[PDB]
Amino acid sequence: KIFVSVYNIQDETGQFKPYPASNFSTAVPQSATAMLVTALKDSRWFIPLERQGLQNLLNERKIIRAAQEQSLTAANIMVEGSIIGYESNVKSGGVGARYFGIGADTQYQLDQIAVNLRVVNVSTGEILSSVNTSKTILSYEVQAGVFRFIDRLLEGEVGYTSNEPVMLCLMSAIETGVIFLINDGIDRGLW
Amino acid sequence: HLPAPTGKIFVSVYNIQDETGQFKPYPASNFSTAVPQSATAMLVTALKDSRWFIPLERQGLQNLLNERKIIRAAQEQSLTAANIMVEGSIIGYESNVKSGGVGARYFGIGADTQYQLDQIAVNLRVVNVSTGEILSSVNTSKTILSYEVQAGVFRFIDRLLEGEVGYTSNEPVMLCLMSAIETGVIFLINDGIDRGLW
Amino acid sequence: KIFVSVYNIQDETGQFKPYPASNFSTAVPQSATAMLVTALKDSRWFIPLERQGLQNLLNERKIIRAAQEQSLTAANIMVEGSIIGYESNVKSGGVGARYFGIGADTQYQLDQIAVNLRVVNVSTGEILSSVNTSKTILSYEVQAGVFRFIDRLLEGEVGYTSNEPVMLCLMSAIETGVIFLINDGIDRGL
Amino acid sequence: PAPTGKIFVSVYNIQDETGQFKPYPASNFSTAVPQSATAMLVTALKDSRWFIPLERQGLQNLLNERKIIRAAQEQSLTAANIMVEGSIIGYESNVKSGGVGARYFGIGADTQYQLDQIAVNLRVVNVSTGEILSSVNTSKTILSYEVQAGVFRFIDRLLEGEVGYTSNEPVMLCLMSAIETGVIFLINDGIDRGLW
Amino acid sequence: KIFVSVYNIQDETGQFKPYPASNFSTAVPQSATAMLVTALKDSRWFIPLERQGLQNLLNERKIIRAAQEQSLTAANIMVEGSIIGYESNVKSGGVGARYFGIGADTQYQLDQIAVNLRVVNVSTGEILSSVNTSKTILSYEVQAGVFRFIDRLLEGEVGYTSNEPVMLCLMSAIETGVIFLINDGIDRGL
Amino acid sequence: IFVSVYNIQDETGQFKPYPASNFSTAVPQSATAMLVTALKDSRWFIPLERQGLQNLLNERKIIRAAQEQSLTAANIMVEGSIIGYESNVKSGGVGARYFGIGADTQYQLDQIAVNLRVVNVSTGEILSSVNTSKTILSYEVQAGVFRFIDRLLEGEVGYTSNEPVMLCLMSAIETGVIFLINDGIDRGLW
Amino acid sequence: HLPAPTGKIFVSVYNIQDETGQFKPYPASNFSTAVPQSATAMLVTALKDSRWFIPLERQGLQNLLNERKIIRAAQEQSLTAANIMVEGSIIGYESNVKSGGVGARYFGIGADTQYQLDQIAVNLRVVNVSTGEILSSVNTSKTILSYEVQAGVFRFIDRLLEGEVGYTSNEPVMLCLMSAIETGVIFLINDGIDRGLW
Amino acid sequence: KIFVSVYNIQDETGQFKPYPASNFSTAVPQSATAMLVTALKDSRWFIPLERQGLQNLLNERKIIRAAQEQSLTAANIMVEGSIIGYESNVKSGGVGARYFGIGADTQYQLDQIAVNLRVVNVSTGEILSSVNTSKTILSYEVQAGVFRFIDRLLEGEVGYTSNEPVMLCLMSAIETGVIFLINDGIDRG
Amino acid sequence: KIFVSVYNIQDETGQFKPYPASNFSTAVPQSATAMLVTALKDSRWFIPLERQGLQNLLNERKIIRAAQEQSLTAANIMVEGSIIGYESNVKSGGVGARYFGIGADTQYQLDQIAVNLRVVNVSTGEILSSVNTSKTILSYEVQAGVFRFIDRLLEGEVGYTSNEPVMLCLMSAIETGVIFLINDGIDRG
């Protein structure tokens, strides 16, 4: 097991959802340094050190020390970085056709998320590695309908829509990123 | 084979925060979050109800410290610590994820139905207080259903006739958050069962 | 009687009314630590200790102490918690029908509010109990109308709407919550 | 009821905990309820006299003025053994609402009404022990109505006419009212204590 | 003459003009502690003490003291208070009629402004009096028009609108308020 | 003859309506310039700066530094603020159209009020205060022709005038200074 | 008769600020000022160009003080003052003030024109540094023209013919501001000449 | 290898996406001082020194020093600079034609991004070099459709749109900036 | 070569883009004090001194000074100033005509940007020079189209639009400004 310290990884995408959404709602989750710490945890051996999160821990230790009137493990490597970018439509498109009286159509869009992870040495402060990974986010819509006349009338509609969970894609990106960092570390080795 | 625990464990939880960065869309107020700010209550009541575990407050800590100031003053008696700390946050929220619906209209009786699913994710981390090492962590995800059903009639006589009926249901996102945090707490409690920490 | 201290119970619902309303107008009242303090007061025996509210009291005591040139009771239990959640439509629906020429219709929506109360020990700082309770908020509209032709013409409309007072439902929730807190203490007993 | 006697009551602030604002067309910054309590309340306590409101609004200017006085000379400040606290608890609408109307050729007429609710919380607190001696919630309701009548007639030429009237009870008055019954309730409640 | 010191009287109406107006513009002027100071000035005997306004005066005195390298009169009573409330439509209404081809119509609205003034003693800090006064604000619009056919065509329009000056009504309320305060003080008498 | 003026601020609490930006005031922020030049142009008076004072103090810091000589005071201080702004107050207009020549006209009035107060520097007593108010005219005129031939003919002419609110502010501040000086003649202090 | 000056005068100008409180209307961003923030540059270059006058910076002063911190630091030599200080601000802005336009259309050739005038006012004050007394002040006002011209043709043949030509001009509010500050500086300079300050 | 310390490179474009987008959404990524740090990392010889990022490193070292009751490498040159500008439409255009009953059309837009990088000496604080580079950002849309009558009716639509990843163009720009910087440094040296 | 120190040249235009754009988006880049630093660098003789930018430099030197348990060159001149103004339409206009069935049209707008530079003496704090320069910003649109009837139908459309890169024009203005300052120094000297 190797002790890894990670404090914060930002959303540097600087992006927000368009209308109808609230102009306050980010296009990307604020959750990394959770995603990342659990990615390091689940890829074990790595032993995540918290530091989120550090203030509370320090308070708790203050309470402990107060109750009695005993040390805190460090990390030789630190992971840093942020969420590099988000956009759309990137690649997007769709088709459709309507004949009397049955129409049908379909649409799709792709999005991009990029992430940067950096392994930095704690002793020398040198950056031992850094990587950019980018996943893509699918969205699609399918519709079919029927408009027919008799005389009286008839009509019908069916439809389905899917959005890949940006949070899941982020998780994917940070995981493949950690895989890459570990792999890169194997040729170092530091281990 | 067989596992076994021993006794109650004091757990301190300060903030489990909303890292979703999300807010409801229009018509809603752009200030209204898509997700409750209420965890570190949901979680604290999960730990209280999942006993044996003993939540240590710390929300919440300052008011207590003040009250202790009043006590110490009025008399002119220590404060128990927690050996584990739970942390984490609400990892994410989105929509439509999966969504869709169908409908049909024949003269003169129409009907239709629609539905949407949403997702919320939560992260819980058990961290050791002495060494500051993270002992465990889990990501959990619930989904949030919404659906609408409508039926109607347009008919001519000569005179005329029409009618409408409809029903809608939205799963309570707060309940879904709670459900998620329960799933996470169950997961953590078993991992500790195989450890044991106890 | 037991002295109970309550400082802040907060709105953690993070919700605001939709349009036409002002985006600054909360979906839920800010009034708890009053509603709750009066709930504890009214179920007495409990003796709410203020602390809202505390600063003014401290100033007033400064003034007294100056004018005289006599202590301040504490509480062994503290109540905490907040308003956990709010939403809508949750469940909603309605029906209606129109035949010549008399139409009628009706609608309803239900909402939810949840609350958390926690009894915490002041001495050791341990949480003695915590409970979540949730009420629901009814709203409905009724309309009836007539459209008739003669030659000349005739029409008429009547309607009524009712919305349950979200504030009252909050009071209800906090009250039932006070009941649950009171009960678990009975087997404690403290 | 009855005075004695006079009791010094200090009130610093009673605040709007309603968190409510007027809807469109109004400005989203415009509160649904007045910020004027701790005036309304001070005058309510005053008008029910005996009570002797002690200011504390307001205290900063008074202390500055005393600085000026003390400066001109190069004499104390009475305190209150009770403190009144509390806030504006809640506001809404439509709560209860409705209306009717009918039109025959060519004379139409109609009327509508809405009720709103305002709630207040007052708490009498002991200054010496810091104990809350009482707390009360009162709620008034706010009436509004609109009336219209009209005529559309044809001759051939044409004729039309309209008349209308609307009244909205002054929310500020209902707040004052609420705090007034609240002061009454507080006084009565104190009557059996008695502390006074 | 009696020296009266007045520092702050602020807008507690929490109200703002509706659309089309800018959402930042108050429904009520911020000018009180002037209107009041000039009202007391005009009601003489009273001698307004500034204190607005005080910081600048203190600076100026710093400069005076600096140039020379003579005291500052106080007030035994202080006036306080604020603008209590504003609303609309309160009472409002109107009529109108149109016959071929001449129409005419009229409308009116009333608004309300309330004020609170309090006389407080500077020595004891006791409130010697407090009063709430409320004026109302009139507005009306009148129109007349003609639509006629010849064959060709004819039309005409005339209209007038008047809105009472909210600032003036604030002044009216603050003045009548001053009358109430003096009136109450005379039976004291101090 | 030395007059010191630090503050005159916008207490109108008003902003322009739509189409304008909600950040744009209905009234200039410029007084303590208008007023200082009004006192200057009305001489005898000698404006003492103090806007504006901080920069000067820095400059004197520099002078004093380069050398390793005093600063004149004022026995009277002028104070006050912009009391109010409104519209439509009085407004109206007419128009008529006959085939094919139409014409029409409209007008609106506004109000601006200002308060000036002379305050004594030694005793801090207010020696005088006045409210003065100007009014602001706006008008529009249009004329047009719609005619058919068979083909067609049409034409339009129009003119609009808005009195410069800033200028009206200047006017109010000047008449105010006139009044203050005049009343001062019977004091006189001068 | 005859006047006369002597020598260069050191003038310090810290801030000349926008007191207009005005912003462009829609379509523009509500954050966009109706008037430039650039005076105390415009004015400083006006004083620089009307030389003899020696603008003293002080904008601007902090960076200068830092650079001198660096200089003084590297060596281990004084700082000139200004005998007069100029102050003032942008007093006001508006529209339509005077505005209007005409136009006519005959078959099938129409034409029309429109115009708007705006105003900017500026205040400059020469203030004495020693006694702090104000030696002079002026209010000046420029006006800002805008106009549009259009011509068009709608004609029928059978088939059809149409045409459009148009031109618009807006005077540069920044130019008008500069012009205003120039007129104020000119006024102040004659006034000082019969003073003299020299 | 030369040790290069880069603290922050900032977005000085002052630009945000237009409607429908949120008025809070930057038109340009905030991600540089990652992009640039990884560009210098990928261009070796260079050894990026962090400094992002520095506070956490310092805290961690505090913890380490606490556990023991061992020094920190510096950089002799520092890279600075920022994202200079962004705009559109800059160049834009498109064509299209529709005949009975088959229509088709296409659009395209270009955007610009500029970047400034500056090599500064740490000892003397002198700017050894500074360069501005600018990439451009392609976007295009294509549609084709058929509207026909029979008697009954028939219609169909197909379309595709591609938008170049502004983040990529930013990366490309910062890389080209690095190339210029290295070129300038070699001629010094 | 002369050492020149430049800290801030700011956007004093107070202007922001109109609708559809975000109300937070400046009409003008925030990039000057880079543009200016690269203009001075490119005009050598001159040696831009950083100072942006200074805090990181001082931190780095803290790291250096700590690692060893060597001075920092000053500038006798400082360049200051700001972006003085931005506007539109200023001059704008256009023509167009349509005959059956072929129409065509074109329109254009001009914008203005002005910049102010000031050379200030560091020793006496006196302003040695200041200049205002202003460039103008062209934008134009061209379109041509055909609507024809047969019976059947026909239509076609082509169009092209260009916007001069406001960032480029600012660069231009700041450059010409640097020229003016250099000349102004030439007769000084």
Residues written for chain B? 198
Going by C-alpha positions, the residue among D28, G22, E24, E169 that lies closest to residue F14 is E24
CB pairs under 8 A between A and B: 173
Nearest to E73 among D72, D78, D170 (CB): D72
User: How far apart are alpha carbons I146 and I132 in whole angstroms?
Assistant: 48
Q: Is the peptide bond before E81 cis (omega within 30 degrees of 0)?
A: no
Going by C-alpha positions, the residue among E109, H55, I56 that lies closest to residue A80 is H55
User: How far apart are alpha carbons B156 and B143 in whole angstroms?
Assistant: 44
Subunit contact G165:I80, Cβ cutoff 8 A:
no
Subunit contact I50:H127, Cβ cutoff 8 A:
yes
Among G33, G68, G91, pick the best mutation site for testing chain F contact (most F Cβ within 10 A).
G91
User: How far apart are alpha carbons D48 and D25 in whole angstroms?
Assistant: 39
- Structure determined by: X-ray
Do G and C make contact via 3 or more CB pairs under 8 A? The reply is no
- Distance separating the N- and C-terminal Cα atoms of chain H: 14
Q: How far is G174 from chain F (nearest CA, A)?
A: 19
Please state, in angstroms and as integers, the Cα–Cα distance from residue E126 to each residue in D10, D56, D75, following that order: 10, 10, 13
Structure tokens at A32: 């990394």
Structure tokens at F110: 């506004």
Residues of D in contact with E27 (CB under 8 A): 30
Three-class SS of H89-154:
CCEEEEEEEEECEEEEEEEEEEEEEEEEEEEEECCCCCEEEEEEEEEEEEEEEEEEEEEEECCCEE
CB atoms within 10 A of CB B103: 18
Please state, in angstroms and as integers, the Cα–Cα distance from residue H75 to each residue in A76, A180, C21, H47, H126, following that order: 21, 27, 57, 9, 15
Structure tokens at B180: 């998620």
Nearest residue in chain B measured CA to CA from C120: B57
The H-or-E segment that residue A167 falls in is: helix A166-186
Subunit contact A85:H167, Cβ cutoff 8 A:
yes
Structure tokens at D70: 């003390």
- D70's CB contacts (< 8 A; 6+ apart) are none
Subunit contact F166:G101, Cβ cutoff 8 A:
no
Residue type, H101: G
Strand partners, G89: G17, G123
Residues written for chain A? 191
Residues of G in contact with I146 (CB under 8 A): none
Note the resolution in Å, 1 decimal: 2.9
Identify whether the C-beta of residue E131 lies closer than 8 Å to the C-beta of residue D43: yes
Going by C-alpha positions, the residue among B151, B22, D156 that lies closest to residue C14 is B22
Q: How far is A23 from chain H (nearest CA, A)?
A: 5
Going by C-alpha positions, the residue among I171, I169, I79, I175 that lies closest to residue I130 is I79
User: How far apart are alpha carbons B72 and B39 in whole angstroms?
Assistant: 32
Among D7, D17, D35, D157, pick the best mutation site for testing chain E contact (most E Cβ within 10 A).
D35
Residue with tokens 């956009």: A87
- H79's CB contacts (< 8 A; 6+ apart) are H4, H5, H6, H9, H36, H40, H117, H118, H119, H120, H181
- Residue G51: helix, strand or coil by DSSP? coil
Residues of I in contact with H73 (CB under 8 A): 67
- Residue H84: helix, strand or coil by DSSP? strand
Q: How many Cα neighbours within 13 Å face the side chain of F172?
A: 28
- Residue H25: helix, strand or coil by DSSP? coil
Please say whether the dihedral angle defined by the alpha carbons of residues E146, E150, E151 and E154, taken in this order, is positive or negative.
negative
Residues of B in contact with C105 (CB under 8 A): 164
Nearest residue in chain A measured CA to CA from B85: A57
User: How far apart are alpha carbons B25 and A16 in whole angstroms?
Assistant: 12
- D68's CB contacts (< 8 A; 6+ apart) are E5, E72, E74
Nearest residue in chain E measured CA to CA from D35: E12
Nearest residue in chain G measured CA to CA from F31: G91
The pairing of beta strand E91-99 with beta strand D158-168: antiparallel
Residue type, G9: I
Identify whether the C-beta of residue F58 lies closer than 8 Å to the C-beta of residue G61: yes
User: How far apart are alpha carbons I146 and I99 in whole angstroms?
Assistant: 9
Please say whether the dihedral angle defined by the alpha carbons of residues C37, C40, C41 and C43, taken in this order, is positive or negative.
positive
User: How far apart are alpha carbons D56 and C61 in whole angstroms?
Assistant: 13
Backbone angles phi, psi at H23, to 5 degrees: -65, -10
CB atoms within 10 A of CB I126: 16
User: How far apart are alpha carbons C173 and C152 in whole angstroms?
Assistant: 55
Subunit contact I155:H27, Cβ cutoff 8 A:
no
Residues of E in contact with D150 (CB under 8 A): none
Nearest residue in chain I measured CA to CA from H8: I56
Subunit contact F121:E73, Cβ cutoff 8 A:
no
CB pairs under 8 A between C and D: 179
> What ranges in chain D are assigned the alpha helix state H?
40-47, 59-72, 171-191
